[PDB]
Structures are given as C-alpha cells and as structure tokens.
Design a binder for this molecule. Structure first.
Ligand SMILES: [Zn+2]
Lengths: 192, 72, 71, 743, 265, 127, 57
RNA sequence: AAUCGAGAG
DNA sequence: TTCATACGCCTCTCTGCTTATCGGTAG
DNA sequence: CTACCGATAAGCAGATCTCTCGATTGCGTATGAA
C-alpha cells in the first residue's frame, strides 16, 4: 500500500491546489467575480438563498462535485502506478486489482491516494438550517472538505469530519441495499 | 373591591410639570405606557389618579488566549 | 433629586395600593408577580437649562351568566 | 398523584342530590424487601425464575364532602417491579466487595427489571421537544379535511409530572385558524380565538397588538387577523362575556372530560382550559398561556407567509428522549387514575342497583375496596413482560406494542449496548420513507455515527455517544428570569411587540422578554459567560440555551433557554475560560465547535470537544483504528461484536437463564484501544490474540473463508461453552386447592 | 426507471400516463436558430408564467378591487415565450376573468353559509357585460404594465383573501396549450393532432414513444416494437442487455388477445 | 425452587442447567475487530501448515483477496502493532485520530519492529 | 388602524360601517356610541408563486 | 395451532 | 348472600372497476 | 312531450424468498345447590 517519497510529494502538491476548489465553484454558481473572498457578504447572501432553495442547492452540489472529481482523477492518474514503492508484478494489491480477482482500481485509488468526494445521492452533504455543514465548520463555508471532499486516504487515516461524512455515505449505501434486497419477486412470480 | 386592603395614596406626592422620558434601571442606589399616572396623580391634592394631558451587564470574558490554547 | 412614594378617556381611575399593586376602579371598566429588579422604573423630567434632572418612581355590561347545569 | 384529579360521585339522598365522595390520593411509598420481616436481595427470583418485585403503598381519601369527614387509609396495591441499583433496591449504594458478598457481579450495574427471571428493560424512545412550538408542513394536515393547509404549529407540552399533551394549530385556507388537541383516545377541535378570549378577560385590540406589534403597515397579517376576528364575531355573537364563553366551553365539553353532574359550566370550562391547553404552564399561568398563543399564532402566519422556514420533526434539533423511568411513572399514574375511576364506577353500580349506601361507614369502604382490583403491581409486571401499552389517554405517544426489550447478555458488549440504544418508533419502522433514516449532521456529538444495526432496523436503532448524559432532573430555573431582567430586556407584559423582527426570550415555554437581535446575541454570550464561570446562585451549568439569529427565510428567531427534564447533554471545552461546558442539540447547531485544538481558527470558534473520540459509541471506540477502515465495515464490526461468544459475567454459578455462550478463555487485546481499560472492559474479556498470516496458501479460502491450525485448536484455541437452563414442574396444571397426585 | 418502470409497463399494462416525454433531433435541413422555436411554441404556457406581481387594493369606499397586476418586460417575455401581447390580452379578456371571477362568486356564495380613445371603451363593453360588472382597462404601448379590472361586488365589503385565490387562478389559467402537451426536448404525451406539418425541426422524426398513446391509433402490432424497445431501454441503463429473444417471447401481452393485455388478474 | 407463598407441599418445581461444550468445528464463524467475518474452512494439520524461520506455525489463515474489496487497513495495522507489542512486551494503543499523516502508524510500528530486529514491513519469510 | 380604528373606550372591534348609522355597540355594549362618517373608507393594498421565468442571482 | 420478538442467509 | 363454573362482550400507499350528474336527440 | 344511452366525479377487493431460535396465548359475568 505504501508510496514512494516522490509519489507522496506529487499527491500533496496536487491536493494543495484544491484549496480554492469550493470557493471557485461557489463564485461560478453565484455569478459573482472569479476572485471573490470567501467572507464576502454578497457571497454569503447568495449561498443562503442557494441553501434555502433545493434546485440551486442541487446545482451548486453538481458543480462542486464535478470540480472535485476532476481533482481526484488528476491525483489518481498522477500517482498510481508511478508512486507505489512496489510495482505491479510483485505488488499483490495492485496485481489482484488489475487481474480483476477482487477489488477495483477505484478501491486501490481510495486506499492509496484519495477517497475523493462523498456523494449523498446526487448531492454533496446535507446542511443544517444555519448553513453549517458540521459543528466544526464556519457557517456558509466554501471549503470542499467541509462539503464532504475527503482529502485523506485509508492508508494514512482520516480526520474526524471526514470520518463523519464517510459514515453518512456508508449509511446511505446500506439503506439503499437493505431496501433493494427484496425489492420485487412478485414481478417474476407473475411472469412465470 | 379590596383584595387584601386599601392603603391608598392619601399622602399625595406632588411632582408638578408645565422633555420627559422613562429611565428604567435595575437596582442602583439612586404607546404601551399604561403606567404614566405615577407622577401625575391628581394635581388637585385629592385621593384619586387622573390621566395626563447600558442596562445589560457586560461582564465580558474576551480575548481567548490563542497562543495558550492552540497547542501544535 | 430622587423621590419615592391605544386608549384614552376622561379621568375615572384611582389608586389602591393594597401592598405598587392596585386594582383600580371607575364607572366604565372594572380593572405583576415577576421582574423583581426590573420593577424599578423611574420618570425623568430633566430641566435642559444646564444639568437639572428630576426622578420619581370592563364590566359595565359584562355580567351575563348561563345556567350552572344544562339538562 | 396529587394532580391526578378529584374524582367525585354523588349520593342519591332526597337542587341537592346527596353526598360526595371526593376520592383522592395522598402519597405513594417504597417497599423493597419481602417477608418476621427480612430483606430480599437480587439473584432471588433469578434462581427462583420469578419476578423481583417490591410493594406499592397507597393512601387515599374518602372526603364525603368539603372538609367534613375525611377517612384516610393505606391501601397498598400489589407489588411494583423495582429497578436494580435504583433507590428501591437493596443494592442501592454498596461497595463492590459487598456486591461480591451478595451473590452479585463484582461490578454490577443495570436498569433492567427482573420479571419472571427474564431481566427485561425499558427501551428509550425519542420524541418532540418539551416546551418549544415547532412548525410542520406535513400534507396530513391538509388531508385532515377540506380547506386544511399543510401548515400548522405543534407543541408537545409536558406537565410538571412529565405528562405529554399535544396542542396543534391547523391553518385553514379560508383564513381562520383552528386550535386542535386530543383527549382520551379521540380528538376535539375548537376555534383559536375562542380559547384566546376564554383564557383571560382581554379585548380584541389587545389581541391585535399581540399578534401584530408595530407591523400595522403590513397588509397580509392585518387582513388575515381581521378575517379571523370577524369570523369569530359572526360565528358566536352571544358569547360576549368571558364567563359566558367559559360556560360555553363547559357545556360543549361535559361528557368529554367526564365532568361530574355537580359542576358549573364556568368551573368545567376553567378546568379544561387549565388542564388540556399549554399544560406546561400549569395553573394560574393563564395570563402567560394567553401570551404564548399570541406568539404561536404569529409564527404560524410567518410560516404561511414564508418568513420562517419549517422545522424537521426528525431532526435532532427538535428531538428529545424520554427515559425508561419517566414512562414507568407515567403509566403508573395512568393506572392509579384508572383505579380511582374503577372505584367510582363500583360506587355507581351500587347506587344503580345495590341501594345500600352510607358514604360515611368504614365497613362500607371495605366492601367497596374488596370488590375492586388491587393488582396495580401485577399489571405493571404484565406491561414489562409484554410491552403492550394500554391506557385511555394514550400518553400522546404513537406506538402501541413494544416498549420492553429482553435485554440479553450474550456478550458484555451487547448487554452494555442495551442501555444506550434510542429508538425512533415502531410506526417509523413500518414507514418506508428513506429520509428519516439519514444520518443528519445535527446528531454530531449525541448519537453514534457508526453504531447502527444493519438490515431492517438500520437507521433507526441509534446509540448515544459515550460521555453523553441525559439530565433526569429539573434544574434550578427559578431565579433565571430575575437575572435575565437584570440585563437589557423588556417584561413580557409591560410592552407588546411580536414578530420575528424582535428576539423573543423565553424560559422553558414562558415568554418573558422581547429585545432586538443584537442585544439577544449579547445576552446569549453573557449568559454563557456566567454559566461556565460559576459563582452564580442560579444558572446551572447544564442549561441548554439556544440563540437563533435573525435569518433571511431561515428558522424563526428568538433567544431560548431550557432547564429541561430529559434533554440531551454533551460536555465540551469552552475556549474563553478553558473549563468544561455542557451543550445540547438545539444549542449546538449555531455553536462554532472545533474538533481539535489544532484546528481552532480566529474568531470562528468558541468550543473544542476534547478527546474527539468522544463523538462515538462505546463499542465503536473499542474498534482498533476505526479511522483506517470503511464505514460499512465499522458498522459490520459493531453489529458483530454484539454477536460474539462473549464473557457474560462471573456470577454464572447462579444465573439460571436460557442461554449464556460462555467463552472458556480470553486475553486482553495487545492493540487494545485506550478507554478499553477505562471502561473496565478488561473484567469481561472476550476473544484471543491469534498469530494471523495474510496469505493465500491452502486455497480453501477465497471469498471469506478462513482456516484454523488443527493443533492450535487441539491446544484449545477457542472453547466457548453453552449454558442452558429450563424449568421443570408439575404444578402447571395444578390449581390452588387441588394438590397433585404426582410428585 | 428500474423495477418501478418495469412493473408499471408489464405487471399492470398501465395505460395511465406515467411520464412519456417528447424528443426531437435536428432535420439536417433546418438550422439550430429555428431549433427549439417549435418546442417553445408547442410547450404549455400558463398565464402565471408571465406574472411578475399582483397588486390588490380593497377599497371599502359600494366596494372596490383594483387588481393592478404586473407582467415582465414586454420584449423579454415575448422572446422567452413566443406569446404575443395581443394573444395575452385575448386570453385574459376571454377565459381568465370569466372563469376565475365565476370561481370568486362561488367562494362568495360559500362564504355566506391614463386616457382612452373609445377603443378602450369598446374593449370594456363585453368585459362589463361579464358577470361581476368589473371596470377593466389594458395596455397601449405593447408593454404589460396595466391590466387592471376593478371589481365591485356590493356594500357588503366582505373580507376576502383576494390574492390567495388569485394565485390559484393564475395557476389554473393557460395561455396556449394543446391537449396533453406540457436534445431540445419538451414534455407531453399526445399522438393525435401531434401530426403537425413536418417542416420546422425534424418534425418528421419525433417520438415520445410510450404505450400511453402509440397503441391507441398509431399502429396495433406496433406493440411488438414499442414494448420491446421500452423494456430494452430500461436495461440499457445498466447495460444488463437481456437477449431480444426474451423481449419478443413476451408477446402474450399483445398477441394473445387484441391489444395490450397484462400479467395480472 | 420453593414457592413464594407458604406452599410447603412437596416442592414440585425444579430448575436445571445444561452445560454444552462448543469446540470450534468447520463453518463456525470467527471474526476480527474489523468486520472481516468468515467461517472455519478446514482444520489444517499443523505439519502441512506453513511455518516461518522462527518455527512458529500460524493458527489463523485469511486470504489476502478480502482486503481490496473490504478495504480494512485496520486489520493490517492491528497485525503490525500486535507483533510489535508481543515482541517488546508493551501494550499498543489503537485510538482513532492519534496518527496524523506525518505520524503514519505504519512508520511508527515499523520503527519498533526494526529495533526489535524483525522485518520493517512485517513480511516474515516462511517455508 | 389595520382595518378599523377600534372604539377608544373598549378594546373590541366594532361592526362594519355598512350599517344604519353609527354602529358602535356590540363590545359589551361599549358603554358609549360615538357617531359614524368620521372615517372615509378602508383600503388594504397587498401584493403576491410564479417561478418559471424568474431568474435573479 | 396461531401472534410477537430476536435474528441468519 | 354467597359460592361454583358455564357462559360472554369492545397513527404516513395505490390500481382497476362498484357506482355517480346530466343532457342531447330523434321519436 | 320524451326513452334511451353516452359525455361528465367517486365505492369495493386487492395487492405487494428460505431457514433457525426465543417468547406468548384478550378481557368479562350469570345460574343454583346449599
Ligand atoms: Zn367599545
């Protein structure tokens, strides 16, 4: 699972460019200036309205999700497999990933490089009525990480907020699987 | 109609007037206004009442010591 | 100098001070257990000459009643 | 029992009718042991496989009329199933050594009740708040009937004995607002302005000022209010006098409240508006009950106009958990009231047919009581055993069947988890909407993000985070208004000013002050200062205070204070003083907590929850390196740990039960999490350290199989054993007076 | 999608319109400038969609109701929705006022339980002939700024919402909508009279293909091409791609009888 | 068990307890503390079990293919820290949010294993 | 004020001006009936759910 | 013999 | 009057096919 | 004038895998020999 020093340097140097991802997404969705401070009262008002109305909330979530997914793809492509200290023939994890015995390139990517963004349905993350994603975040915060963008990895651990978001996503997935476990056998019984 | 007695204002207090505001205070040692009969009671020296013609304690505890509580 | 002791109509009310608290009376109408320290309202009559200040601190047709019990 | 009532029947003695009964209840006492009197410790009725019940002492009155002939009598009713380690148990405050002496676990704790030797427990339930009117836009309100809207304010008020009473304000599309409530098992609806005029001798212009304060230039509110007033005037022209409307209510509700024949209509109306509306303000608070509805209505019109956002019923901001003990007391009070009703009914039947009545004879009282049921304790035992709640009022709950869990002890992990689960509701379990099962951010610090069973009950059986406490005690809220008036506020009566434009201030549902929003924020901060600083006769640290700032289309503004009696609490550091502070859910949402002292920003933080692990269940904290796994795998681990071949305990010598699953050996985890020892889990070790090899060697394990070393098994790698007990007797068919021929 | 659509399409043979949606590529003969012009012309347009604000002035005086409604900018809303100023005036004068003031009279009964050049007067003739004897006046400079029709009920001056009803009124009003019609995709479920002159944008090739309307008139054995196409279009999402032999062996739905049987009672 | 009442009679009420020995056969679900539940496939004989340089024969064998799908790095970290603790004699703490990325637990336990003289990554040669 | 300047005696609203003359009675008889025609009229100008073409952010 | 609860696949 | 035992009463999901009002035309 | 039946809002029956355990079995009232 480990990476080389240059691989970790690549990963960090690409992640540190994602500081303003959420801020730029908000600036574009609000039709404000491209370079707008995150504390602008106009920006806060626009974000308040966007939180209030579900359609604009979904639009902002889609835009920011697109940007952060692009960043995640960049990180994964740059790092794997040019950062792993053990290469494919001997790297057991990457070998059973590529060979398709188990797992997937997505699993390897989120283990070694980045979880990315936790998508709750088609939306980033539910927000409290005060525009505060978690009790640990500024109201109307323009950070992708605050919006559910997990900058950590399963190898080096995740911050508590990222753990909370990942728990939410896993809960959503488990709910969907439990609901669809026995969705309809009546269709098949009627047809037969 | 005595609730528990009528110790009325027979000892009238004279506060004559011909620039006036209420100045509510909490406890220092010295128009929903249906209490404006305290100063004008009768103006006729008679036992009757007649109609007329930062309090918040700051106690700040400010300036959190970031240098002390923000330990690396 | 400190001393201690929508609607309009001609003078009809009065003061009782059962002990402050009254009940009041008149021929037209028929007229506090909180704010222990907020009760200290005073009336300002400041004279703006230089610095001078002053300080100082219905049933007419409502009696209808139905039967006690309705069978 | 004091507030249960004054059930009265009348003698048929020829406007007078006879003599009253005025049956009441004075006190309820404690009786733990069982007899020549000897104490009975637990593990009894465990070995016996029976119930560990106390005895219920009951004293009543037989006042034939107002203070003439009072006949007090102690009338004990059956045996109450008491709770272990509680006040009514011999093991109340014992040393661990004393517990060991008394056939008890070396460190035994439990709220479970021993009935039939089954050790059941009252599951916690989570419901709406206590004295906070919230807005609901459910479509069921509109579907109630024609011209009904989706809107409507709801407040789940609670009497000082923690008795719930819902009071809903449906909004009709025509322009009139209809107060709604419920009595018995049914519902009864009345116009709002009726109750507004009945509460106090107050005029309509005063109601105009109450609903609209300095918002006269508004058109929507003024027109709606004028429509309401005109509708009331045209609907009830005769009802002019306050006494007249009181009598109207009394006659409209005479068999509704089971009112006695000798009861004036004014008396009955006063009783109903004192008992069924805004019950949390108690008696003699009608002056504030009238003041509350004027606040509740204005919010409803704000909801209609959209000036305020709705509030999610399933969000933890407005959620609240009632404990096991509170439900026990509530159902006990219901049963006592039913018992008094039953003796009244027996007297009624004797009057109807027996015609042998004295109302002043001790022999007559004995005849009456001997013919009624004194099995209050037996029915409480039945309730614990089955979970089938039966009552007349319904407790303003929503479930019917299922309140007591078996509370098994397969593992110590499962057993301790039984006491931290909070259930949303079986009605919600039957519901198929997903959005209720979401993991809301508002549940940060209170419910475990991880610990949740996987499957059908997923997203419902949440567990409280460790180091989370429930304040089961009314705080000293008496002096809070006084110090509140000390700051810059205005009394709730001297001036009239309503609407979201002014920060309403209320303490546990008592409107006491109105002030600007800036001053409201200042007051909230200063109150925080004085609460954490101590050195103040009032203001308990566990004071849930919530200041909702003015918002554009947001939640309804106004400062809030909550002394509370079952509210959730959570410790957290307080930056300006670096002292422990307590925060509740409603309070948390607007508080800038920081999860680590490292991340504390400048001006964007006031609190930092030390030990960020605290936002987690106990079993979740027991998982090693939970920050490196996948959340579904963490949930799988939490569900699996409760299924382990555990170490049930050490008193297994005499713990006759159906199944134990005792693991013979066990070792501490070499990689044990911190707080594994701090929770004393070491006294209940389970599992073993194994020399694992991540290797694909045998080929007999691809999906999830695994292979144990045969010799290591022969060494006794894991040797869990099953203990199973069953009851054998021959008296199951035997009756009381017929000894069996077989032995 | 998924099992919902599958059950709705084969378990019950739901002739009830669930969500068939219009669709149109380009014709290769008409540019994209004229594209979506046909779509907006055929799209359902409601009067509320051009309402900016509604002003009600209930003067007790004998009464008054000066409904001085306001629209968007003339050219702006004309470009966004191809609705003419004259067409809007016509629909307001004909259907809106008549039907919805009739609704107002119904609720009233339930409750009891500028300069002109005589052309404006000629306009007012029939509008006054309307039931509530209103006094209407309208726009002159082609912009929607004045659509005031002063009602006058009686001296009863009953307190009515008068804006809560008007909102539902404008939601009920329709400007120009052909029946059952709500990628340049529009929404609607209709086949008859959808056969417009195929000359605007690929009007020859347009299909909201769904059993809701196809099997009724636009073919009968076309079931063996609509049912299979739709059921395959479901699995085409997740690319499960069951063999077409099964999607045609499912023919007891159509051929076992006349038209569109179901796998139920 | 005797009757609560003074029903001396002949004591027609007895409760007995059964002891059942549950030795782990094949198909009995074992698990770790990370949801990596599984069944006992087969009691592999010790001689046929692979051994190491030190002569220890592992008792529990799991298949490495589980991890890429399950994604439980906690199992690996627990194995590493468990070896380090069993060697040095000390007890290893596993508390979430104590290892920052600059304080990787892999490195932290590898240092201990190296100082103990074992493989830094835990890869023990075996036969 | 809102829709009727209430009687300055009591705090209860009168009836609508559409009466015979000076309807100022039904508020506990109001113990006073001042005449009418002292108020011109009552007008309550109010404004308005039209989200289709609304675009502003 | 039915109902409820615990589950597992 | 009672005892013994057979008798003894009451809250969150949607189709498809019961049927409605209602008038319009050749007789 | 008017018989008949095809345009129009609403009442009845019916719906949504296999296995192992554990637990439990509403509540009430009358006759007649002594
Ligand atoms: Zn009056």
């Amino acid at each position: 699972l480990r990476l080389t020093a240059e691989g970790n340097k690549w990963r960090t140097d690409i992640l540190k460019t994602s500081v303003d991802t959420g801020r730029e997404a908000a600036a574009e969705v609000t039709n404000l200036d491209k370079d707008t401070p995150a504390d602008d009262p106009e920006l806060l008002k626009r974000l308040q309205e966007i939180l209030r109305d579900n359609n604009k909330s979904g639009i902002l979530d889609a835009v920011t999700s697109s940007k952060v997914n692009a960043i995640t793809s960049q990180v994964v492509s740059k790092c794997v497999p040019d950062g792993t200290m053990k290469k494919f023939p001997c790297n057991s994890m990457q070998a059973m990933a590529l060979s398709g015995a188990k797992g997937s390139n997505v699993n390897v990517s989120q283990i070694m490089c980045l979880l990315g963004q936790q998508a709750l349905e088609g939306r980033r993350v539910p927000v409290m009525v005060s525009g505060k994603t978690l009790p640990s975040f500024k109201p109307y915060e323009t950070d992708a990480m605050a919006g559910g963008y997990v900058k950590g990895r399963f190898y080096s651990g995740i911050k508590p907020q990222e753990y909370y978001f990942h728990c939410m996503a896993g809960r959503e997935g488990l709910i969907d699987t439990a609901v669809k476990t026995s969705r309809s056998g009546y269709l098949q019984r009627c047809l037969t | 109609s005595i609730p528990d007695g009528f110790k009325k204002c027979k000892h009238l207090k004279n506060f004559p007037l011909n620039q006036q505001q209420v100045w509510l205070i909490k406890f220092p040692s010295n128009n929903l206004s249906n209490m404006t009969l305290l100063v004008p009671s009768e103006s006729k020296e008679s036992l009757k009442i007649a109609s007329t013609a930062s309090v918040s304690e700051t106690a700040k505890i400010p300036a959190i010591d970031y240098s002390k509580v923000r330990v690396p | 100098s400190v001393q201690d002791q929508g609607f309009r109509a001609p003078s009809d009310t009065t003061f009782d001070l059962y002990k402050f608290v009254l009940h009041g009376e008149n021929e037209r109408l028929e007229y506090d257990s909180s704010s222990q320290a907020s009760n200290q309202y005073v009336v300002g009559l400041f004279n703006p000459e230089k610095k001078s200040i002053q300080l100082y601190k219905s049933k007419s047709s409502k009696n209808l009643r139905g039967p006690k019990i309705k069978s | 029992v004091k507030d249960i009532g004054e059930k009265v029947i009348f003698d048929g003695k020829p406007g007078y009718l006879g003599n009253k009964l005025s049956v009441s209840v004075e006190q309820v006492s404690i009786a733990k042991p069982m007899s020549v009197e000897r104490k009975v410790y637990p593990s009894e009725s465990r070995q016996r496989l029976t119930s560990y019940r106390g005895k219920l002492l009951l004293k009543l009155k037989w006042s034939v009329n107002n203070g003439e002939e009072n006949l007090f009598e102690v009338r004990d009713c059956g045996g109450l199933p008491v709770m272990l380690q509680s006040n009514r148990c011999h093991l109340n405050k014992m040393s661990p050594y004393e517990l060991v002496q008394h056939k008890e676990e070396s460190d035994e704790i439990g709220g479970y009740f021993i009935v039939n030797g089954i050790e059941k427990l009252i599951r916690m339930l989570i419901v709406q708040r206590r004295n906070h009117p919230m807005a609901i836009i459910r479509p069921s309100f509109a579907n109630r009937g024609a011209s009904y809207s989706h809107y409507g304010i709801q407040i789940r008020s609670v009497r000082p004995d923690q008795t719930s009473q819902t009071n809903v304000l449906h909004y009709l599309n025509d322009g009139q607002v209809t107060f709604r409530f419920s009595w018995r098992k049914n519902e009864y609806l009345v116009p709002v302005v009726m109750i507004l005029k009945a509460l106090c001798h107050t005029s309509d212009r005063e109601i105009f000022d109450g609903i609209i304060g300095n918002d006269v230039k508004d058109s929507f509110l003024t027109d709606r209010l004028e429509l309401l007033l005109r509708g009331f005037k045209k609907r009830y022209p005769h009802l002019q006098n306050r006494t007249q409307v009181l009598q109207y209510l009394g006659d409209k509700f005479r068999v509704v409240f089971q009112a006695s024949p000798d009861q004036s209509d004014l008396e009955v109306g006063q009783e109903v508006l004192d008992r069924i509306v805004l019950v949390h303000l108690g008696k003699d608070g009608s002056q504030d009950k009238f003041r509350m509805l004027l606040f509740m209505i204005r919010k409803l019109y704000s909801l209609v106009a959209g000036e305020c956002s709705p509030d999610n019923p399933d969000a933890t901001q407005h959620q609240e958990v009632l404990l096991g003990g509170f439900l026990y007391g509530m159902i006990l009070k219901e049963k006592i009231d039913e018992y008094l009703q039953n003796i009244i009914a027996q007297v009624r039947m004797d009057i109807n047919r027996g015609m042998a009545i004295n109302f002043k004879d001790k022999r007559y009282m004995s005849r009456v009581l001997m013919r009624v049921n004194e099995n209050i304790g037996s029915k409480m035992q039945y309730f614990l055993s089955t979970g089938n709640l039966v009552s007349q009022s319904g407790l303003d709950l929503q479930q019917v069947s299922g309140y007591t869990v078996v509370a098994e002890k397969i593992n110590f992990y499962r057993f301790i988890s039984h006491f931290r689960m909070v259930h949303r509701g079986s009605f919600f379990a039957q519901l198929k909407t997903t959005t209720v099962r979401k993991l809301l951010p508002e549940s940060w610090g209170f419910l475990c993000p991880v610990h949740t069973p996987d499957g059908s009950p997923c997203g419902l059986l949440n567990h409280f985070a460790h180091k989370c406490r429930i304040s089961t005690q009314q705080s000293d809220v008496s002096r809070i208004p006084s110090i509140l008036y000390s700051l810059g506020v205005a009394p709730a009566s001297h001036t009239f000013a309503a609407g979201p434009s002014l920060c309403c201030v209320q303490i546990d549902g008592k409107i006491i002050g109105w002030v600007s929003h800036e001053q409201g924020k200042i007051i909230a901060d200063t109150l925080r200062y004085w609460k954490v600083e101590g050195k103040t006769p009032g203001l308990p640290i566990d004071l849930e205070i919530g200041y909702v700032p003015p918002s554009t289309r947001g939640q309804y503004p106004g400062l809030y204070l909550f002394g509370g009696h079952s509210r959730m609490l959570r410790p957290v550091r307080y930056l300006p003083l670096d002292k422990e502070d307590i925060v509740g859910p409603f309070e948390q949402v607007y508080m800038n907590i920081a999860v680590t002292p490292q991340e504390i920003q400048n001006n964007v933080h006031t609190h930092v929850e030390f030990t960020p692990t605290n936002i987690l269940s106990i079993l979740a904290n027991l998982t090693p390196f939970s920050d490196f796994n996948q959340s579904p795998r963490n949930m799988y681990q939490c569900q699996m740990g409760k299924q382990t071949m555990g170490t049930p305990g050490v008193a297994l010598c005499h713990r006759s039960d159906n199944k134990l699953y005792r693991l013979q050996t066990g070792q501490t985890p070499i990689v044990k999490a911190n707080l594994y020892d701090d929770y004393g889990m070491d006294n209940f070790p389970n599992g073993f350290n194994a020399v694992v090899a991540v290797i694909s060697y045998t080929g007999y394990d691809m999906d999830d199989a695994m292979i144990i070393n045969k010799s290591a098994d022969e060494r006794g790698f894991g040797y869990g054993t099953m203990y199973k007990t069953e009851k054998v007797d021959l008296a199951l068919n035997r009756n009381r007076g017929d000894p069996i021929t077989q032995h | 999608l998924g099992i919902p659509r599958l059950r709705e399409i084969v378990m019950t043979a739901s002739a009830a319109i669930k969500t068939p949606q219009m669709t149109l590529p380009i014709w290769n003969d008409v540019s994209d400038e004229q594209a979506d012009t046909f779509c907006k012309s055929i799209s359902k347009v409601l009067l509320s969609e051009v309402i900016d604000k509604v002003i009600v002035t209930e003067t007790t005086g004998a009464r008054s109701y000066v409904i001085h409604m306001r629209f968007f900018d003339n050219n702006e809303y004309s470009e966004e929705y191809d609705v003419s100023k004259e067409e809007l005036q016509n629909v307001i004068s004909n259907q809106f006022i008549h039907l919805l003031e009739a609704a107002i009279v119904k609720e009233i009964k339930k409750q009891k339980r500028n300069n002109m050049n005589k052309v404006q007067r000629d306009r007012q003739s029939a509008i006054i002939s309307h039931h509530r004897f209103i006094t209407k006046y309208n726009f002159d400079d082609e912009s929607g700024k004045w659509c005031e029709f002063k009602l006058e009920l009686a001296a009863d001056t009953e307190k009515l919402l008068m804006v809560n009803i008007v909102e539902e009124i404008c939601r009920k009003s329709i400007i120009r909508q052909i029946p059952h019609i709500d990628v340049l995709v529009t929404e609607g479920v209709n086949f008859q009279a959808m056969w417009d002159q195929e000359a605007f944008i690929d009007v020859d090739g347009i299909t909201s293909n769904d059993v809701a309307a196809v099997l009724k008139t636009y073919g009968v054995e076309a079931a063996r091409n609509t049912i299979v196409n739709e059921i395959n279009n479901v699995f085409s999402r997740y690319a499960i791609s069951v063999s077409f032999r099964h999607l045609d062996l499912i023919a007891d739905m159509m051929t076992r009888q006349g038209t569109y049987l179901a796998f139920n009672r | 068990i005797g009757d609560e009442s003074n029903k001396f009679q002949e004591l027609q009420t007895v409760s007995i307890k059964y002891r059942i020995r549950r030795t782990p056969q094949i198909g009995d679900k074992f698990s770790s503390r990370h949801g990596q539940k599984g069944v006992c496939s087969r009691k592999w004989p010790t001689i046929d079990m692979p051994f190491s340089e030190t002569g220890i024969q592992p008792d529990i064998i799991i298949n490495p293919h589980a991890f890429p799908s399950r994604m439980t790095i906690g199992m690996f970290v627990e194995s590493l820290a468990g070896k380090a603790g069993a060697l040095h004699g000390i007890a290893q703490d596993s508390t979430p949010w104590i290892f920052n990325e600059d304080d990787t637990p892999a490195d932290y336990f590898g240092e201990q294993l190296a100082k103990a003289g074992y493989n830094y990554h835990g890869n023990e040669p075996m036969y | 004020v809102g829709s009727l300047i209430f009687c300055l005696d009591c705090g209860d609203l009168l009836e609508n001006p559409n009466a015979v003359l000076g309807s100022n009675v039904e508020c506990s008889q109001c113990k006073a009936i001042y005449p009418k025609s002292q108020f011109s009229n009552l007008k309550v100008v109010t404004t308005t759910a039209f989200p289709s073409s609304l675009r502003a952010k």
